[PDB]
Amino acid sequence: GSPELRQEHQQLAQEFQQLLQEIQQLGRELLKGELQGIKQLREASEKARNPEKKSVLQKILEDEEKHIELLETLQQTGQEAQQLLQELQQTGQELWQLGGSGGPELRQKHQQLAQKIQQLLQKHQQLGAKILEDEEKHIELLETILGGSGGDELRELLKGELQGIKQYRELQQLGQKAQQLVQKLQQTGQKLWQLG
Ligand code: HEM
Ligand SMILES: [Cl-]
Ligand SMILES: [Cl-]
Ligand SMILES: [Cl-]
Ligand SMILES: [Zn+2]
Ligand SMILES: [Zn+2]
């Protein structure tokens, strides 16, 4: 009955909290990697004399600098989602006590926070997808200038960039699970009200 539902809603919300934390942490790790990659890039780009290599490295550098801002915006929306979660927690625990009693505004509020969190999650996924895509384009660009012999520093850059991709992917994967939890929270939630 609702008792198992209330338990399930509660468990999902807890999972969601653990995951969100886990994601914030991975995104700070990504930011450190981006900043480290940029440092290696700008040295390589400055040291380059071959014009083809130089122009390529410059395009990748420029784009990598832009990822920093995208990541900051991602971090902020992350931290916003944690704040909405706090209010879901607080409002939720009052609904626990109140049930369906009184006017609907508290139930509405809970429901709207869940809506906003869902929207932040999508924005999050879209920003992430934009970073990943351009990061894969940079792998491609590096490959165009690693023909033949040499490029030992270019290979270090390729390697750090591939490692960044791995981390980005790990993170899109956690966010997918987060959006899935939120779906489930909405489904179990609605059922709590329907059964009421
Ligand atoms: C928007 C659709 C949702 C509806 C209709 C809904 C409905 C409810 C209801 C009726 C309760 C009271 C029962 C209980 O306390 O277990 C509740 C509690 C709660 N909800 Fe939701 N909810 C929704 C989404 C969310 C989301 C997305 C989260 C978190 C991301 C969340 C977190 C909570 C929490 C933490 C509680 C208190 C759990 C507890 O400690 O008892 N809810 N929700
Ligand atoms: Cl060169
Ligand atoms: Cl590009
Ligand atoms: Cl992918
Ligand atoms: Zn990047
Ligand atoms: Zn690019």
Tokens of 110: 């809970």
Pick from 90, 110, 191 the residue to mutate for probing ligand 1's pocket: most ligand atoms within 8 Å of its CB: 110
CA 148–ligand 5 middle distance (angstroms): 26
Q: Report resolution (Å) to 1 decimal.
A: 2.0
CA 134–ligand 3 middle distance (angstroms): 6
Does 18 sit in the ligand 1 pocket, CB within 6 Å?
Answer: no
Rounded distance between C-alpha atoms, residue 49 and residue 111, angstroms: 59
Q: Among residues 194, 192, 177, which one has the least CA distance to residue 95?
A: 192
In one letter, which amino acid is 33? G
CA 142–ligand 3 middle distance (angstroms): 10
Name the DSSP letter for residue 91: H
Q: Among residues 161, 182, 34, 39, which one has the least CA distance to residue 118?
A: 182
Phi–psi pair at 109, nearest 5 degrees: -60, -50
Q: Among residues 72, 106, 71, which one has the least CA distance to residue 90?
A: 106
Q: 30 and 192 in contact (C-beta within 8 Å)?
A: no
CA 135–ligand 6 middle distance (angstroms): 6
- Going by alpha carbons, the residue nearest to atom 18 of ligand 1 is 92
Rounded distance between C-alpha atoms, residue 14 and residue 5, angstroms: 14
Q: How was this structure determined?
A: X-ray
Domain ranges of the chain: 1-196
Instruction: Convert 139-195 into a string of H (helix), E (strand) and C (coil).
Output: HHHHHCCCCCCCCHHHHHHHHHHHHHHHHHHHHHHHHHHHHHHHHHHHHHHHHHHHH
Residue 117 burial (C-beta neighbours within 10 Å; 0-12, 13-18, 19+): buried
Rounded distance between C-alpha atoms, residue 168 and residue 178, angstroms: 15
